[PDB]
Amino acid sequence: DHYNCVSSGGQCAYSACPIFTKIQGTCYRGKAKCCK
Template sequence: MRILCFLLLTLCLLVSQSVSGIGKKSDHYRCVQKGGTCHFSSCPLFNKIEGTCYNGKAKCCIRSY
């Protein structure tokens, strides 16, 4: 009986670790939701850097008026 409880506890811990990443939005998705575009080079004219994309490898550029 103790072995069964130990196996169940181990299974629950493994599942909780794998589920923790579900529901997190990527930085690219958040940039596009704000109306921005992702660029690996500098932002186009009349745009400002508002964050990052692709795990910090690119810039999120949003038009500034």
């Protein structure tokens, strides 16, 4: 979720994760990726 994603150092990204990050869970009621 958003709390875990960002508290762990990640980005909530709709659609896709930018280079040097990859999908690890979700944010925003499952509608975005958590990218770390």
